[PDB]
Write an enzyme that holds these catalytic residues in place. Sequence first.
Site, mmCIF file in Angstrom:
data_model
loop_
_atom_site.group_PDB
_atom_site.id
_atom_site.type_symbol
_atom_site.label_atom_id
_atom_site.label_comp_id
_atom_site.label_asym_id
_atom_site.label_seq_id
_atom_site.Cartn_x
_atom_site.Cartn_y
_atom_site.Cartn_z
ATOM 1 N N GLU A 1 12.986 38.115 36.197
ATOM 2 C CA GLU A 1 12.537 37.261 35.105
ATOM 3 C C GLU A 1 12.642 35.784 35.473
ATOM 4 O OE1 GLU A 1 14.286 38.467 31.246
ATOM 5 O OE2 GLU A 1 14.477 40.445 32.170
ATOM 6 N N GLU B 1 9.569 45.224 36.276
ATOM 7 C CA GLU B 1 9.812 43.794 36.403
ATOM 8 C C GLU B 1 10.024 43.385 37.859
ATOM 9 O OE1 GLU B 1 12.587 41.958 33.561
ATOM 10 O OE2 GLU B 1 12.166 43.625 32.200
ATOM 11 N N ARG C 1 10.085 48.740 27.727
ATOM 12 C CA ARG C 1 10.724 48.142 26.563
ATOM 13 C C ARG C 1 9.894 46.974 26.048
ATOM 14 N NH1 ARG C 1 15.724 44.574 29.237
ATOM 15 N NH2 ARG C 1 14.405 43.410 30.714
ATOM 16 N N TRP D 1 24.659 37.241 20.351
ATOM 17 C CA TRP D 1 23.797 37.307 21.526
ATOM 18 C C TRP D 1 22.323 37.509 21.188
ATOM 19 C CZ3 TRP D 1 27.725 41.092 20.746
ATOM 20 C CH2 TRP D 1 27.259 42.318 20.238
ATOM 21 N N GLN E 1 22.014 34.836 29.840
ATOM 22 C CA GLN E 1 20.679 34.685 30.408
ATOM 23 C C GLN E 1 19.488 34.619 29.443
ATOM 24 O OE1 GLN E 1 18.108 37.452 31.047
ATOM 25 N NE2 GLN E 1 16.857 35.709 31.710
ATOM 26 N N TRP F 1 38.027 34.921 31.182
ATOM 27 C CA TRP F 1 38.377 36.337 31.168
ATOM 28 C C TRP F 1 39.168 36.736 32.413
ATOM 29 C CZ3 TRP F 1 39.401 39.855 28.008
ATOM 30 C CH2 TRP F 1 39.329 41.223 28.324
ATOM 31 N N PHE G 1 34.235 33.128 26.813
ATOM 32 C CA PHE G 1 34.138 33.936 28.022
ATOM 33 C C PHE G 1 33.980 33.032 29.240
ATOM 34 C CE2 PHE G 1 31.563 37.179 30.580
ATOM 35 C CZ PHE G 1 32.637 38.033 30.793
ATOM 36 N N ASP H 1 35.194 34.386 21.384
ATOM 37 C CA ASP H 1 35.302 35.796 21.037
ATOM 38 C C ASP H 1 36.758 36.205 20.889
ATOM 39 O OD1 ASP H 1 35.136 35.558 24.136
ATOM 40 O OD2 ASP H 1 36.043 37.530 23.796
ATOM 41 N N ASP I 1 38.258 39.076 21.854
ATOM 42 C CA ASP I 1 38.791 39.675 23.072
ATOM 43 C C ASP I 1 39.419 38.634 23.998
ATOM 44 O OD1 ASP I 1 39.122 41.554 25.343
ATOM 45 O OD2 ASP I 1 37.705 42.786 24.215
ATOM 46 N N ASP I 2 38.643 37.625 24.386
ATOM 47 C CA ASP I 2 39.151 36.569 25.261
ATOM 48 C C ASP I 2 40.330 35.863 24.603
ATOM 49 O OD1 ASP I 2 37.717 36.097 27.865
ATOM 50 O OD2 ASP I 2 35.961 36.133 26.546
ATOM 51 N N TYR J 1 32.429 38.597 18.164
ATOM 52 C CA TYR J 1 32.106 37.220 17.823
ATOM 53 C C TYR J 1 32.111 36.914 16.327
ATOM 54 C CZ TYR J 1 30.544 37.142 22.704
ATOM 55 O OH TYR J 1 30.465 37.220 24.075
ATOM 56 N N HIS K 1 43.230 45.454 22.156
ATOM 57 C CA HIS K 1 43.666 44.239 22.828
ATOM 58 C C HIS K 1 44.346 43.288 21.852
ATOM 59 C CE1 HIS K 1 40.504 44.769 26.288
ATOM 60 N NE2 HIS K 1 41.496 45.638 26.351
ATOM 61 N N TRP L 1 33.053 47.707 25.567
ATOM 62 C CA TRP L 1 32.790 46.735 26.622
ATOM 63 C C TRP L 1 33.352 47.160 27.973
ATOM 64 C CZ3 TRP L 1 29.445 43.183 24.900
ATOM 65 C CH2 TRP L 1 29.411 42.929 23.518
ATOM 66 N N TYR M 1 38.649 53.797 29.623
ATOM 67 C CA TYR M 1 38.850 52.383 29.328
ATOM 68 C C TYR M 1 39.415 52.216 27.921
ATOM 69 C CZ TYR M 1 37.824 47.455 28.426
ATOM 70 O OH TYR M 1 37.940 46.128 28.090
ATOM 71 N N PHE N 1 25.773 46.920 27.058
ATOM 72 C CA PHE N 1 25.201 47.646 25.932
ATOM 73 C C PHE N 1 25.152 49.118 26.324
ATOM 74 C CE2 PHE N 1 22.656 43.548 25.355
ATOM 75 C CZ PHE N 1 23.512 43.058 24.376
ATOM 76 N N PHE O 1 22.540 48.338 29.135
ATOM 77 C CA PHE O 1 22.939 47.260 30.033
ATOM 78 C C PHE O 1 24.370 47.455 30.520
ATOM 79 C CE2 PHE O 1 23.673 42.687 31.111
ATOM 80 C CZ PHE O 1 22.548 42.513 31.914
ATOM 81 N N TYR P 1 32.268 43.949 36.979
ATOM 82 C CA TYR P 1 33.315 42.939 37.054
ATOM 83 C C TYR P 1 33.998 42.976 38.416
ATOM 84 C CZ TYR P 1 32.863 42.107 32.024
ATOM 85 O OH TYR P 1 32.383 41.766 30.778
HETATM 86 C C1 LIG Z 1 33.484 38.812 25.024
HETATM 87 N N1 LIG Z 1 33.861 40.057 25.759
HETATM 88 C C2 LIG Z 1 32.725 41.048 25.853
HETATM 89 C C3 LIG Z 1 31.375 40.458 26.212
HETATM 90 C C4 LIG Z 1 30.960 40.278 27.463
HETATM 91 C C5 LIG Z 1 29.620 39.699 27.793
HETATM 92 O O1 LIG Z 1 28.775 40.797 28.173
HETATM 93 C C6 LIG Z 1 27.422 40.490 28.360
HETATM 94 C C7 LIG Z 1 27.018 39.462 29.266
HETATM 95 C C8 LIG Z 1 25.643 39.172 29.445
HETATM 96 C C9 LIG Z 1 24.645 39.901 28.727
HETATM 97 C C10 LIG Z 1 23.166 39.561 28.953
HETATM 98 O O2 LIG Z 1 22.874 38.809 29.877
HETATM 99 C C11 LIG Z 1 22.025 40.101 28.111
HETATM 100 C C12 LIG Z 1 21.016 40.882 28.744
HETATM 101 C C13 LIG Z 1 19.929 41.393 27.992
HETATM 102 C C14 LIG Z 1 19.844 41.126 26.600
HETATM 103 BR BR1 LIG Z 1 18.424 41.784 25.628
HETATM 104 C C15 LIG Z 1 20.848 40.348 25.957
HETATM 105 C C16 LIG Z 1 21.936 39.835 26.710
HETATM 106 C C17 LIG Z 1 25.058 40.930 27.821
HETATM 107 C C18 LIG Z 1 26.438 41.221 27.639
HETATM 108 C C19 LIG Z 1 34.495 39.859 27.109
HETATM 109 C C20 LIG Z 1 35.985 40.253 27.235
HETATM 110 C C21 LIG Z 1 34.922 41.041 28.027
#
Ligand SMILES: CN(C/C=C/COc1ccc(C(=O)c2ccc(Br)cc2)cc1)C1CC1
Lengths: 619, 619
Positions: A36, A84, A118, A160, A253, A303, A356, A365, A367-368, A411, A442, A480, A486, A592, A596, A600
């Site tokens: 992209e 893509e 998609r 997000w 992103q 983090w 983060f 957030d 978590d952090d 969030y 946590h 997450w 986990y 997700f 997604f 790490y």
């Molecule tokens: C705050 N917590 C949990 C969150 C972590 C962040 O995780 C992410 C990071 C990036 C994305 C995308 O880029 C994304 C890509 C495609 C689309 Br559609 C939207 C966003 C998504 C999730 C921390 C302690 C671990």
Amino acid sequence: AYARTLDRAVEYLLSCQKDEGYWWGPLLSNVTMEAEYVLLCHILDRVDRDRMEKIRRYLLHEQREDGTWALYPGGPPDLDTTIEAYVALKYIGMSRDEEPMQKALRFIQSQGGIESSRVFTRMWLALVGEYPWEKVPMVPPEIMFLGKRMPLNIYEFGSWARATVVALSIVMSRQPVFPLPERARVPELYETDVPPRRRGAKGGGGWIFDALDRALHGYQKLSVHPFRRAAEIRALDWLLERQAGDGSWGGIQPPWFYALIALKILDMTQHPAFIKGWEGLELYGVELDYGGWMFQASISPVWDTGLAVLALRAAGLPADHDRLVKAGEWLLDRQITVPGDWAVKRPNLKPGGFAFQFDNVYYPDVDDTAVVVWALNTLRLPDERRRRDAMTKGFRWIVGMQSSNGGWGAYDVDNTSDLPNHIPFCDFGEVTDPPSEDVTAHVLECFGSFGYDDAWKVIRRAVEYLKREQKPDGSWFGRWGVNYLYGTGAVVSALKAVGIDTREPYIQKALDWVEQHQNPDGGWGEDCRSYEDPAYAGKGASTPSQTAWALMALIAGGRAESEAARRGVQYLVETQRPDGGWDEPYYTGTGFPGDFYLGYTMYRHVFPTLALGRYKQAI
Amino acid sequence: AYARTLDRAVEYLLSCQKDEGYWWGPLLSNVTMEAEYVLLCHILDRVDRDRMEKIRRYLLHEQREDGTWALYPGGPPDLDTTIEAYVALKYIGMSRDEEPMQKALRFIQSQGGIESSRVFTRMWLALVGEYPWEKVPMVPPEIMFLGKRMPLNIYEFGSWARATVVALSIVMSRQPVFPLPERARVPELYETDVPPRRRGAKGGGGWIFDALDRALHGYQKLSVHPFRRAAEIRALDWLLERQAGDGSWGGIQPPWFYALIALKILDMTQHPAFIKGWEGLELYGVELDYGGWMFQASISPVWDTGLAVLALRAAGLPADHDRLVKAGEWLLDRQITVPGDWAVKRPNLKPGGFAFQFDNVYYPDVDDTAVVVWALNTLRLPDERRRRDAMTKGFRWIVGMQSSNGGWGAYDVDNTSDLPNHIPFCDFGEVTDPPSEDVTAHVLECFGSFGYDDAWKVIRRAVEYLKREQKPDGSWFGRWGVNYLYGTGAVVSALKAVGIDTREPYIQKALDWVEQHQNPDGGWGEDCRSYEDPAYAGKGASTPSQTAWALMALIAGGRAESEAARRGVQYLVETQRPDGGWDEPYYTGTGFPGDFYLGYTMYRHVFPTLALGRYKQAI
Ligand SMILES: CN(C/C=C/COc1ccc(C(=O)c2ccc(Br)cc2)cc1)C1CC1
Ligand SMILES: CN(C/C=C/COc1ccc(C(=O)c2ccc(Br)cc2)cc1)C1CC1
Ligand SMILES: CCCCCCCCOCCOCCOCCOCCO
Ligand SMILES: CCCCCCCCOCCOCCOCCOCCO
């Protein structure tokens, strides 16, 4: 035995720490980011031949023998991701003849072509003129008029998704087209006899929305849209007010990219916001030793730093270790003190959370925040004043963020609407930010460090939440993080901290579950497929992180001095590298569920250490 | 004779040109700039000891024997300017005992003290807690609700005043106070028996506004202001949308400073807009060889470049002179192509104007545009395409900017409202931007270069405007330049270009007026007092620029081969320096008649050359 392992693991983490005193490992995802980005440059008319090369090496390098690309390493081929990547490559130079292109095109056609991709994919292709906007879910700028408490207002979506919607509303409002040169045209994405297998809205679609959409496209063709101008400005301003310090938008992103496109559409390429937004991109880029280049979906400095501290502490280093102090100091200058979008639901709540990434004040957030505060509560900083004060602020903020069900989100608070899950546009990943078990856990463990036990109501409400969510087999879902190992590892570890009796039934039923999945090699593993097929729940190749998690669950449940226990410890000790690190060719992070996944980089070093540290504590 | 003068003048200008190919001479004003900057740093809590020093040297250096400061060199002492300088110094370190402070305090008390100062002065002192906000003209954020066509809407003010009002509305909405340390407290500014001689609104005040203000201060004390929140945001957004590329706001000191304060009040110090706005300041700063440091009220790169070209051309250099080409090229990349606030009155007008400074897209002015286009029409650039196209765009824009009375303003069209001139707040300088003779003249001469004569209606309408404005003594007022010599010189020169018959009566009556003021030394001069006392009209020490202007008027009127003509030429030739330059210890530029004066550094070199160039043409 494990001593040498720890000592080696420690000196290693200490060697990764930066001068400023923080840790920061790259975050892995999939080629859609880079792909992209290439299209983005085309849109913004800022293509760098040199960069394109590095991006090409990357794309090919990530392509498998079958000529496809997946969301995670060792995962099934993904249509979207591949489509893509295909388009991206062809634009850079690759000819549809070359093998890489051939094998890819194959898989694409065998799936129904572009008509099976998609929404976003079709949208991007629409931006370049390879797909009609008419067949793309409409999202009007007018959405900016919805009040705080109305169906589908921008604040019912996840942090997000929110920004993304706002940015795109402007884009879809003008439906711009940035034609690709003939050599790049990708009509072959249509040539297919296979029936199009379109993906529907996440939570299912209702004829209502379906009709509403059809209506919107109709209203889109009219010659006059009253108040639309104002709507657009409402969005433009919304974005201008929340732009991150590094020039991004949310530190992710998607919105960042769309916001830039939006600004390009409004002829604001010479406006500060844009300039800053553009040059800020480089910070997220990464040079690969093999000549490649990638773009991080997001960055996790805070983090990593946080966990890294808790790891080294649980390992053995002094609470005032000069090196860990650098981290403490650093972490204090990160705390946010201004209101964020979360304030819309908690106007009387005092700021104090953390983010983060480096600079993202409007989106802290839980978590952090929890981990950072917890990490600080284990250190001895020179200025006990700010340390004491900081923890207090963060502590309170977390408390005020607790949702209704007694659980914690990421969030926002009670961001549990259900309407957005049925919109045509939303067909990829999460769209809302409801409470999750892992985050909650946590939080509890964070309070536990202070002492607050089950006596306090807040704790009880949460504990109940966890009990009601526990799966039949006595495991806990991983939001997450991949996955049941986990989550379960988190919960148990937390409950143990809040004073709960580890002997409890549901608790034991969990520990047993852990032992029952211990791979033969002595370690634990859970493939990302566990989000699609429940059969893989707890199954998968052994990994340093996942092994450490399942290990913490046991050590917490008192079964530290057990067979499976010592067994797993053996794994980590053996699999450790000469430098003291650890390898992990698999993803253990989750963005997700089923859509997604993240990788790490630090997890493979941090958690294994934290586990061995807690094992050396039980003995 | 004059040849050597020209040749020396030419090589000099060419040595001043920068690498990029443009000219940029510092713009002088008065110490209120530096003084307020010191207070700004205090507000933003960003004081740099080192910088303070450089600022102190400057302030003292600019103080006269009587211990005061004036708007222009050799001008009467100014209360406001002095009060602000006094406060500034005392904050830096100066003790009220030291002689400089003593003599200053004297003059201040002999005028009624702080109660006699302008609004802004009292406002700044109010921001630091040395004056009650209650006694400061109120300007509510609600002003943001006024529609495009309503009494006192932000678009009835001048571009320069507009942004300031918007920014301050937020500031006055919260009425913040940033206390000064005890050592800096300046209560002595009150100790005075002399009766306070307050200055009223520019065009006089009406009991209405007076009452309205008293009302606003009352509404300010209430516990709940409905919709005020929205009002504030309306302003914040307005500012965030128009921030200049260099981080400024309009490219001028005032709004820029207030916008920053406003952002500080809204806890947005970590927002891109603020960051950029803060570091952008350095570009306007200037290091003085004697250890001092000053802050330019604004920058004139484009303006200087433009005139510099027309000067060298009229001098002799080829229309394709490799050096002048650099300028041409540079000037082309400056043209604006996006809509500005001027669009509110001309929505169907295509962008094409230019700005005063480097990057200020939302605020192009007719004067610069005209000169830049005119300058280009005299050059032969490699790419005749963009040159032809650029001139066309700019040309048309100018035409579409013509006001009703056939005259041209500076930034807007028919910005001739009268209401704002009676508001309590407005008691310093201009508040509206009505058509002016000098700007109009420049426009006519711009078209003239193309050939368009009196035949074209647009030209005629303008000519009539000039005829109706001419003063009894046959002279023309100078708006953005000191003064009657500046204006008269402009008009005549222009009219001569548009084909008008120089033999005309009113024309001659003007030329005679010029000759009648020629000082003994052969040159011409006009002190800035000519704005206060009509007796100084055309009177004053001879200056290179003013002498050149009056010289152009004659050369244009055909009287080039006259006594007074050759006489003046002699002056320039003699007064010229060995390096080919010229000195000018006086201001010849005007910001606001009788309130703000400017010192254009290049004028002393450019105009004298342009004059000699046009004289060498008549022979
Ligand atoms: C705050 N917590 C949990 C969150 C972590 C962040 O995780 C992410 C990071 C990036 C994305 C995308 O880029 C994304 C890509 C495609 C689309 Br559609 C939207 C966003 C998504 C999730 C921390 C302690 C671990
Ligand atoms: C576009 N034309 C004419 C305009 C020139 C700009 O002149 C200025 C510059 C700065 C100021 C202030 O700083 C000011 C100080 C105090 C207040 Br109150 C407001 C602004 C004012 C006027 C160019 C061709 C010559
Ligand atoms: C956000 C909607 C974009 C459409 C409006 C842009 C057209 C410009 O209108 C001219 C009105 O005067 C304001 C000009 O200053 C422009 C900055 O605002 C940013 C771009 O909209
Ligand atoms: C501009 C009005 C000042 C009111 C600001 C108080 C903030 C209230 O929080 C609202 C939540 O939305 C998040 C906003 O932060 C983004 C930037 O907006 C600018 C000032 O906050």
